[PDB]
Each structure stands twice: as structure tokens, then as C-alpha cells.
Amino acid sequence: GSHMWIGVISLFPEMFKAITEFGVTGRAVKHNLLKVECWNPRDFTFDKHKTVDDRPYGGGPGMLMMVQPLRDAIHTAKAAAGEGAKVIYLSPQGRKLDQGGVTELAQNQKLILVCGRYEGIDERLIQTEIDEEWSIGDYVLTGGELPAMTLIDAVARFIPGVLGDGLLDCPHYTRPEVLEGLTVPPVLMSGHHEEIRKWRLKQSLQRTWLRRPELLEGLALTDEQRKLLKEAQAEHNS
Amino acid sequence: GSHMWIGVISLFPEMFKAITEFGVTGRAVKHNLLKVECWNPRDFTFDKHKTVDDRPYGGGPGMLMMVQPLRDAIHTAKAAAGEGAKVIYLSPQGRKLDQGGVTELAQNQKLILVCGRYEGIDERLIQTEIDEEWSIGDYVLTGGELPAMTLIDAVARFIPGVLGDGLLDCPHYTRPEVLEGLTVPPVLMSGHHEEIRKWRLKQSLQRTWLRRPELLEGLALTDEQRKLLKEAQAEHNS
Ligand SMILES: NC(=O)c1ccc(NCc2ccccc2)nc1
Numbered sequence: 053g054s055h056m057w058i059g060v061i062s063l064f065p066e067m068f069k070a071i072t073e074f075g076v077t078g079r080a081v082k083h084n085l086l087k088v089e090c091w092n093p094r095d096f097t098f099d100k101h102k103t104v105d106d107r108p109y110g111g112g113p114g115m116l117m118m119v120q121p122l123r124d125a126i127h128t129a130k131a132a133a134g135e136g137a138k139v140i141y142l143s144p145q146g147r148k149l150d151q152g153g154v155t156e157l158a159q160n161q162k163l164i165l166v167c168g169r170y171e172g173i174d175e176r177l178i179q180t181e182i183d184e185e186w187s188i189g190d191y192v193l194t195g196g197e198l199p200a201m202t203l204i205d206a207v208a209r210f211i212p213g214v215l216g217d218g219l220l221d222c223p224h225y226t227r228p229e230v231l232e233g234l235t236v237p238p239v240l241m242s243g244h245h246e247e248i249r250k251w252r253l254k255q256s257l258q259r260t261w262l263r264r265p266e267l268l269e270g271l272a273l274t275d276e277q278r279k280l281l282k283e284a285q286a287e288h289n290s
Numbered sequence: 291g292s293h294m295w296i297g298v299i300s301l302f303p304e305m306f307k308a309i310t311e312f313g314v315t316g317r318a319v320k321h322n323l324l325k326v327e328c329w330n331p332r333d334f335t336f337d338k339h340k341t342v343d344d345r346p347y348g349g350g351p352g353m354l355m356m357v358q359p360l361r362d363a364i365h366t367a368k369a370a371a372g373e374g375a376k377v378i379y380l381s382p383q384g385r386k387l388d389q390g391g392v393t394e395l396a397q398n399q400k401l402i403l404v405c406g407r408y409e410g411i412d413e414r415l416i417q418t419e420i421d422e423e424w425s426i427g428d429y430v431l432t433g434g435e436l437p438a439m440t441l442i443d444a445v446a447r448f449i450p451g452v453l454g455d456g457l458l459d460c461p462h463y464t465r466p467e468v469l470e471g472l473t474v475p476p477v478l479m480s481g482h483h484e485e486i487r488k489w490r491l492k493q494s495l496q497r498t499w500l501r502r503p504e505l506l507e508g509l510a511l512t513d514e515q516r517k518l519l520k521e522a523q524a525e526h527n528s
């Protein structure tokens with residue numbers, strides 16, 4: 053179906069074996085539904101020790117990505133990608149990634165993900181080589197590899213043939229019928245496909261209201277959703 | 291220093307090689323600063339085909355984690371962990387993970403991370419086996435492996451000997467002095483350690499104000515921070 057090519061710039065290309073060789077994403081890669089090609093900036097070095105880090109101007113305790121190997125790696129990825137590729141840099145300063153943001157990034161046929169290590173990359177590289185800056189959350193990691201793999205995994209779920217709403221997911225139950233005294237909701241085993249659908253939607257509205265109330269504020273609930281929410285709030289208030 | 295043991299329940303334990311064999315986290319594991327031990331629920335199956343998924347009550351297109359292999363795997367991890375271990379389940383319905391949440395989870399000496407596949411796990415398992423439910427962001431992934439690895443990587447940065455603020459990070463510059471016409475801020479190459487510190491803090495306040503304004507609202511800025519923010523806002527308004 054809709055093929056998706058993702059170019060990756062990273063000092064540890066082996067980390068991406070976690071998604072290219074396992075689970076649903078590994079199957080999407082095997083079936084040529086998703087192509088992940090990695091470029092290591094270490095291969096673009098020229099000194100004897102293959103230096104990929106550099107000291108930052110102004111002092112500072114930390115280090116940065118060395119510009120020349122990183123910049124050359126990026127240009128190589130752009131050449132292989134051709135035109136249309138959107139270059140993305142993963143950093144806490146980037147745009148917060150939500151499901152709506154995942155759908156947007158999934159609209160791209162070609163993507164280039166720059167994985168930064170140490171204290172990040174040079175600011176001038178962002179202005180000249182990076183199109184969009186993204187963040188998977190307000191937390192700091194040792195590298196942009198995991199956020200990159202998170203992005204790739206997220207957008208992969210939208211590729212046609214990979215698999216087979218605004219609210220939190222309803223509770224799910226499977227065998228056995230009774231687990232440590234706790235029983236499965238009888239409505240789920242009633243066969244009433246309409247009552248079951250209404251139940252699941254109702255529980256989704258309740259869990260969203262109790263756990264993530266701010267998510268409901270940015271939603272325009274349907275007449276059915278407004279009903280089930282009012283019922284859930286009434287039942288919660290005994 | 292402060293040792294940290296993290297037990298992991300996952301159908302793909304090989305994915306965690308991405309953090310246990312590479313970069314800073316891989317070094318922390320090698321130096322016995324961080325221990326990651328994986329249990330595969332597939333090893334706790336008894337049928338010929340090692341079934342680990344089960345059909346959900348009420349119909350539904352998707353599948354769930356089979357309770358018996360998962361439950362047995364969890365109990366085994368608790369036995370090896372001993373007392374004090376906090377069991378965590380990664381799911382979008384969980385508490386949103388921020389840097390403040392990372393610090394909290396880093397206070398635990400022992401952790402058990404349950405990685406859910408398919409449409410998740412049985413709700414009754416969460417009530418009986420899970421202590422805290424967490425989310426790395428408002429997006430859906432093919433599994434809880436990447437969120438688990440994200441958590442492990444995040445809390446690893448707080449382990450003493452692994453390495454060596456509320457605001458977004460300031461711009462960083464390294465060699466060369468001029469890159470495609472763009473120059474390094476002269477203040478950074480002035481040597482003025484006080485002016486440089488004030489500059490970096492000022493840029494952090496400006497980037498936070500322009501990109502993530504909601505982050506500033508939940509902050510009690512110091513007198514110096516209030517000054518530099520007012521100056522940045524004045525300079526931004528020409
Ligand atoms: N929150 C995220 O998406 C994220 C991305 C990367 C990361 N570490 C890489 C990095 C470190 C410092 C500066 C720039 C990038 N941590 C978290």
C-alpha cells in the first residue's frame with residue numbers, strides 16, 4: 053500500500069533493530085511496507101579516532117554533536133531521499149507529539165530523523181538542515197534514538213496493511229470469567245452488540261473524565277457521548 | 291552508587307538490547323549501575339504453540355494479552371525482585387510522564403515494567419498486579435516496549451555515576467565559528483563566565499516563552515529569571 057521511507061541519522065544504528073526486526077513494525081519492514089535506512093555520522097569522520105563530539109562555545113560541562121560529520125551525514129540522507137523528504141529533529145524543545153501530530157507526520161511519504169546525542173546539536177544546523185522540531189514528551193533522554201523509534205512506530209500504525217478517537221480506552225476483559233474473585237461484566241457476555249458498544253463507549257468517557265479531564269475540554273462530544281457521560285457521572289456520584 | 295534494578299515483562303526481550311548494549315545506558319548496565327532483567331510470558335505458556343494472546347469478551351476486532359502466561363511472568367518477577375518493587379504498566383491511560391514524574395520513579399530501587407501488546411492487558415490484572423499506570427505521551431504504539439525503554443533511559447540519568455530546571459534548553463554552538471553565513475554569538479567567545487551564564491538563562495526563558503508558554507505559567511521565576519524574561523520580551527518586541 054502506501055509505502056513509507058524513513059531515513060535515520062544516528063550514532064547507534066543498531067538500536068533500531070528493536071523495531072526493524074521485531075513485532076508489527078519488524079513485519080512492516082520485512083514486507084517492504086516500511087523502509088528504515090540508517091546513516092552513522094561516525095562513518096563521515098576523517099580523523100584517526102573518528103571523533104563525533106565537540107566542545108561547546110561558552111564553556112559548559114557538556115558536549116555537542118560535531119558539526120562536520122553530522123552535517124555530511126544529513127546531506128547524504130537528503131540525497132538518497134530525493135525531494136519531498138521532511139527532516140525532523142528530536143528534542144525536548146520540539147513540538148509536543150500527540151496522536152493528532154502522529155497523523156500529520158504519517159502524511160509524509162519520506163522522513164529524515166536526526167538523532168541527537170550529548171547536549172544536542174548546533175543551533176545553526178537546525179536553521180539550515182532541520183524542517184520541524186519534535187518532542188515525544190517533556191522529559192530528557194540520553195539520545196534521540198528512542199524518540200525516533202517511538203515516532204517511527206507511531207506513524208507505522210497508519211501505513212495500510214500494517215495492522216489488520218480522542219478518548220481513553222475502555223477496560224478490556226478476557227479469559228477466565230473469574231480472576232481472583234473479580235468477574236467479567238455480564239453485559240460483555242450477553243451478546244448484545246449494541247449494549248456492548250454503548251458500554252465500552254461509556255467506560256471510555258468515564259475513565260477519560262476521572263483520569264484526564266483536560267482531554268474532554270478539547271472535545272466536541274456527540275449527542276450519544278454527551279448522554280453516556282452524564283450517565284457515567286450520575287453513576288459515579290452513586 | 292545508588293544501584294537500580296529494573297525487571298521487565300515483555301514478549302520481545304531482545305528489543306531491550308537497544309539500551310543495555312549501547313550508549314550511556316549500556317555502559318550503566320555493563321558497570322552494574324543498572325540491572326535490567328527480562329521475563330518473556332511465552333516461556334510461561336504450556337500449550338504446543340505457546341499462545342500468548344487471547345480473544346476479548348464482548349467481541350471486538352483486536353486481541354489481548356493472555357492472562358495466565360502474563361500473570362505467571364509477573365509473579366516470577368516479583369519473586370526475584372523481593373519486597374519494595376513497584377510494578378508499573380505502560381499504557382496511554384496511565385499518568386502522563388514528565389521530568390518531575392521521572393524523578394519520582396527514580397526514587398525507587400526496584401521497578402517492574404509490564405509491557406503490553408495488542409489491545410492491552412486484562413483490567414483485573416491491573417487491579418491485582420499493577421501498582422501504578424504510566425504514559426510517556428498521548429500517542430498509541432504497537433507495544434509497551436518503547437515506553438518502557440524510554441522510562442528506563444530517563445530514570446537512568448539520575449543514577450549516580452551514569453553521566454558525569456523547568457525551562458527549555460538554550461541554543462548551543464560549536465565549531466566552526468561561521469556556518470553557512472551564520473555566526474556564533476560573540477558573548478559566548480568573550481570569556482565572561484557571568485555574561486555567558488546570564489545569556490544562556492535568558493535564551494532559555496525566551497525559547498520557553500515563544501514555544502511552550504504554558505510551561506512558564508506553572509513556574510515561580512526567580513528575581514533574575516523575571517528580569518531576563520522581561521528583557522527578552524522587550525528585545526523580541528524590537
Ligand atoms: N523529549 C524528547 O523527545 C527527547 C529527545 C531527545 C532526547 N535526548 C536527545 C537530546 C538531548 C539533548 C538535546 C537534544 C536532544 N531526550 C528527549
Ligand SMILES: NC(=O)c1ccc(NCc2ccccc2)nc1
Nearest residue numbers: 380381410425426431433434437
Ligand atoms: N502512550 C504510552 O505510553 C503507550 C504505552 C503502550 C503503547 N502500546 C502498548 C499498549 C497498547 C494498548 C494498550 C495498552 C498498552 N502505546 C503507548
